[PDB]
Amino acid sequence: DVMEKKDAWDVQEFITQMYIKQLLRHPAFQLLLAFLLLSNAITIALRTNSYLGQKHYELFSTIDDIVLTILICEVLLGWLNGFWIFWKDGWNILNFAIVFILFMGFFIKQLDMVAITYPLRVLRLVHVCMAVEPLARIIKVILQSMPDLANVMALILFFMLVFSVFGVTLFGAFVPKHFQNMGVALYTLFICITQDGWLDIYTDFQMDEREYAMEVGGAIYFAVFITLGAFIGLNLFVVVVTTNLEQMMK
């Protein structure tokens, strides 16, 4: 109201207001962080070539140290406002896990090597580029669509199993190497459901009797199952997509 004289908690609130005004609302610091991340992403794309690497490996190490120390500085600044709020968050958990894995693999000896150092960096790149507005709405609804997609995946896999029981009857020890092993058979039926270039399989189970045999029966059974499952799966995918986006425009 009047605020004749401030108190200690008002001073602390004003300090936290200053701390959230900088580095969280100021576009300059976020732009600098994005510029550094884009520069090290350029160095990422400059990899897979020892001809550039032989004069860049030490600079690569230095920029790795720089990006690691600025990431842990940002994490410490987020921790400063409070560990409880940072721990109870949807994306700060992911960022903390990213920096924890990167720092442990850096300081402590680890077999994590390039296959962890580089994808973690590009995951941080994705996380930072989510912050700027004209990708956050689109990203927000991809994660909103996965709970409604999970039931579709569950139904698809259950139907896939209960029709693979029909599948494994005409499978095993004949027309083998893609119909046997009961996991290769499942994944090969998944390939044929994804529906591209299955005439290798068609020629594989071709010539049983050259006229009808089971070459008629099993082939038409699995063909109608494949076409029905593919149509139903694609329809359900686009249906869940249209439902959740109708949610985002509602």
Nearer to other proteins (CB atom), residue 180 or residue 195: 195
Q: In the stretch 132-171, what mask flags binding to other proteins with x, by CB under 8 A?
A: --xx--xx--x-----------------------------
Question: Does 51 engage in binding with other proteins (CB under 8 A)?
Answer: no
Cα separation, 244 vs 187, whole angstroms:
29
Q: Which of 33, 175, 195, 204 binds other proteins (CB under 8 A)?
A: 195
Nearer to other proteins, 162 or 238 (CB): 238
Cα dihedral sign, 228-231-234-235: negative
Residue 3 near residue 13, CB atoms below 8 Å: no
The answer to the question of residue 59 lying near other proteins (CB under 8 A) is no
Instruction: Between 123 and 214, name the residue whose CB sits nearer to other proteins.
Output: 123
CB of 212 to other proteins, least distance (A): 27
Stretch that binds other proteins, among 18-26, 31-39, 56-64, 211-219 (CB under 8 A): 18-26
Which of 83/166 has CB closer to other proteins? 83
CB 75 within 8 A of CB 95: yes
Q: What's the token pair of residue 113?
A: 């090597």
b/e map 47-74, b = 16+ CB within 10 Å:
eeeeeeeeebeeebeeebeebbeebeeb
Which runs of E-coded beta strand occur in the chain?
Answer: none
Give residue for tokens 């579709």: 152
Element (H, E) at 185: helix 184-194
Give me the least distance between CB of 208 and other proteins, in Å please. Answer: 22
Q: Rounded to 10 degrees, what is the CA torsion of 79, 84, 85, 89? A: 100
Interface with other proteins, residue 111, by CB under 8 A? no
- Contact footprint for other proteins (CB under 8 A): 1, 4, 7-11, 13, 15-16, 20, 24-25, 41, 44-45, 48, 81, 84-85, 113-115, 118-119, 122-123, 125-126, 129, 131, 134-135, 138-139, 142, 187, 190-191, 194-198, 200, 234, 237-238, 240-242, 245-246, 249
